Each structure stands twice: as C-alpha cells, then as structure tokens.
Design a protein around this ligand. Structure first.
Ligand code: A1ACJ
Ligand code: A1ACJ
Ligand code: MG
Ligand code: MG
Ligand code: MG
Ligand code: MG
Lengths: 223, 222
C-alpha cells in the first residue's frame, strides 16, 4: 500500500467552541459557535499579566437556531434562548453553514488542528452529529483535533511531580489571577482558551504536533 | 422597506485610493434590526448585543503597504506572508456571500466613509476576480452620510468650517473617550456599532429610506 504522508507540524491552530440547548444526554443542538484561527508563528514566535491576542487572526462567530427549546440551565449559562434566537432571525444548522465553515478553514494553511476545551465530550461529537444530520459526514475529514483538557493535563503532569479543576475559568485564574471576560459565550470561551495556550506555546505546539487526531475518528454524539 | 440585517463593515488597505490599494483586512458584524430597535432593558458606552454574527479576516494584498497604512493598522505585507495569508480569491468571495446568507434580507452593509473607501475597494477586488455580481443582492449605507444627515436634522444650519467625521472624532464627541481599539478592522466595526447605538431608531429610519443597492457602487479602479 502507499502510506499516508505524515502531516508534519500543525500550521494553523483553530481555537473552537460551541454552545448548545443542553447536555449530551438531551441530544442537544448547536446555538452558537466560534472559530479563531492562529498561525503557528503567532505561538512559536510571539511583559503584561494576560498576553494580548496576536494582531493577525481569522475569527468566525455565529448564532444558530437549534429547532428545540434550550434547558433553563443552558439559557441562564449562555444568555441565549430559542425564542430570542428566533427574534434575531437566526437560521438552523444547514448546508450553507457547513459551506461557510469549510470556506473559513480553506483560508488557513494546512495541516489544520481544531483545539476545543472538553472537545471530546462536547464540541467535537456535537459538530459531527450536526454534519451527520445534513448528510455531510465527511465535511471535516481533512482536519486534525485536540481536546485542550487532554493537552493541558499532559503539560501540567510533564511540568509537575507525582485534584485541581480543569474548567476553562479555573486554569485561567491559576495562570493569570483573574476570571475571563464574557464566560459561557462561544467567543468568550475561545478567547480565554487562546490566552491559556499563549502561556507556554512552544510546549503546547510540541504536544499538538505529536497527538493531533484526524477529525474523522470523532463519532457523532447521536444519530 | 425596513432593513432586517445591518452588517457593520470595515476593510483596511495597503494605502489611499490614488495608490490603487489592495485589501489587507476585513470585518463584518451582522446585527438583527431588533438588537438596535429594542435593546435589552446606563454605562458611558452601550454594550454590543448578545446575538451577533462576526467575521474578521486578514488578506495577502500582493504588494507593499504604505508606511502610513502599516503605522495606522499595525499590518505589513511581510507579516501577512509570515502568517501564510491567502490573496483575495474566489474562496473569500464565497465565504462573504455564505456569511451574508446566514442573515435575513434585506441586508444593509454599513461602513464609515464606505462610499470613498470600503465599498468601491470591495467592488474593485470582486471585479478583478470576474465576480462583479457577487454581492449586488445587498444594500449599503455610508455611516458618514447617515450621521451627517441625522446631525443636520438635529442642529441649526452649519456655517464656517465643519467638524471632522473621522471615526475617532464622532466617537469622542458622543462618549468623551477614544475607542478601545483604533488599529484593527474589528475595532473600527465595534466603534461604529457603538456610534450607531446612540440614536438607533433615527438611524434605522434614515437607513430604511436611503439604503442604496450595492450594485450601484462602481469599483475604485479597473
Ligand atoms: C459552560 N458550557 C457548557 C455547559 C457546562 C455546564 C452545564 C451546562 Br447546561 C452547559 O451548557 C451550556 C450550553 O452550552 N457546555 C458547553 C458545550 O459545548 N456543551 C455541549 C456541546 N455539545 O453538547 C453540549 C460549553 O461550551 C460551555 O461553555
Ligand atoms: C484609518 N483608516 C484608513 C486611513 C485613513 C488615513 C490614512 C490612511 Br494611509 C488610511 O489607511 C490605513 C489603511 O487602511 N483607511 C481605511 C480604509 O478603509 N481605507 C481604504 C479602503 N479602501 O481604500 C482605502 C480605514 O478603514 C481606516 O480605518
Ligand atoms: Mg462548547
Ligand atoms: Mg463554552
Ligand atoms: Mg475601512
Ligand atoms: Mg478602518
């Protein structure tokens, strides 16, 4: 057989979050997503308390009509409800949304690595479920992905001897001694994750290069 | 009739129009009419609505930025190439249209000095790709024309030298401080959003009345 070319070093980190109508057991639907694409050089080749975002970034932030009610807890946490999303004329997760995500990713040099906090439990399998419901199961087979919880635990352990919270808020406070702005909004969470990842970016890129998984290996949450 | 989506819009470029400039950066921020008409029920500056769609992209211009452009925007052709940015291409044109198609029509692009800068340069970039018709479904308004019209209708007739309608000048007159960010396309779009949230009902009436089809904007150059 002809073997896969090793992807080599990740050229684009896409910091990624979605918010949903509820918890995975509910078979939730997407209400919000944010992608923030950073070139490797912005982390390999960059003093304030919280480092600023790189000047050169690509960002996409969209609200989505979920087509079912949000749980009360989900609405209180995210400040979104199905009724308000409908008052803002939001459209459901559709072929046009999938086209827009791929067009955005195609502006970035490959290989692409999606980086999401609790990506494996939440954002990655929900995105795969949304794409599977459109019959677009292969849409992101080109991409790599990392759960930043997995990455940051392995960095912490590697930079530790023999339990701390690994909530996005918790890690951020340990590093920076303040809460992140606009928490539990997709863009707020992506900006907080970027800030955490600019802490020891060389160590993070080494880990991402070694452990990035083809997105196609992520099974949909439901279906 | 009533615009359903206001898309606050800014591009940055390699230089001023006489230089036949190329896009280096663009930001679109789509707000539903109701976000301006009926904001949630004060701070010195109104907050942005919770429900927004946002797109912010850097573009490889294919030529050098002027020293003044680089200084004002903090971008250069060398830095954009270091970050592996792609030129203004069919994929970008498709991305912009797919973003607008998330929004209910009618669409109104709102850009500060849009008639001299952002609109004609956007039409120039689309025309050089052979995509002259791509965004002619949209309407557009130059916020300078809008704010001037509102101010004329809310002041005695002007005499002697006129005030600056720079983005910074308008922001400072209203809010008594500089915008948070004066160096990025996204910063300029958020500052314009804040300015347009000052008298949003009077602004929407004017927009509803005076919005132009984007297809009537001639390219900055051929
Ligand atoms: C805070 N929070 C929560 C969350 C945490 C605890 C309790 C609730 Br209810 C949460 O959901 C709030 C709505 O997303 N969930 C997600 C999330 O991606 N949930 C998904 C994805 N796919 O299926 C479920 C977040 O990004 C987030 O910031
Ligand atoms: C500050 N500034 C200026 C600007 C003002 C004075 C001097 C210079 Br040099 C400027 O250009 C800086 C690079 O965009 N120009 C634009 C602009 O849209 N220029 C375009 C668009 N199409 O052709 C030229 C801005 O958005 C902006 O905020
Ligand atoms: Mg999430
Ligand atoms: Mg989140
Ligand atoms: Mg501009
Ligand atoms: Mg500007």
């Amino acid at each position: 057989g002809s073997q896969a070319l090793p992807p080599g070093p990740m050229q684009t980190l896409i910091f990624f979050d979605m918010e949903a109508t509820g918890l995975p057991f509910s078979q939730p639907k997407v209400t919000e997503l944010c992608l923030l694409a950073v070139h490797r050089c912005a982390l390999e080749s960059p003093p304030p308390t919280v480092p600023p975002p790189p000047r050169v970034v690509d960002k996409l932030s969209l609200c989505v009509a979920p087509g079912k009610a949000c749980s009360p807890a989900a609405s209180e946490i995210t400040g979104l409800s199905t009724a308000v999303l409908a008052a803002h004329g939001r459209q459901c997760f559709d072929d046009n949304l999938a086209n827009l995500l791929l067009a955005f990713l195609r502006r970035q040099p490959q290989p692409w690595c999606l980086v999401a906090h609790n990506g494996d439990r939440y954002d990655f399998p929900l995105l795969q479920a949304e794409l599977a419901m459109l019959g677009l199961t292969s849409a992101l087979d080109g991409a790599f992905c990392v759960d930043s919880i997995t990455a940051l635990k392995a960095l912490e352990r590697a930079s530790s001897p023999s339990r701390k919270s690994y909530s996005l808020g918790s890690i951020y406070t340990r590093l920076y001694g303040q809460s992140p702005p606009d928490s539990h909004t997709a863009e707020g969470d992506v900006l907080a994750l970027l800030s955490i990842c600019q802490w020891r970016p060389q160590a993070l890129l080494r880990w991402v290069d070694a452990h990035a998984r083809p997105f196609g290996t992520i099974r949909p949450m439901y279906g």
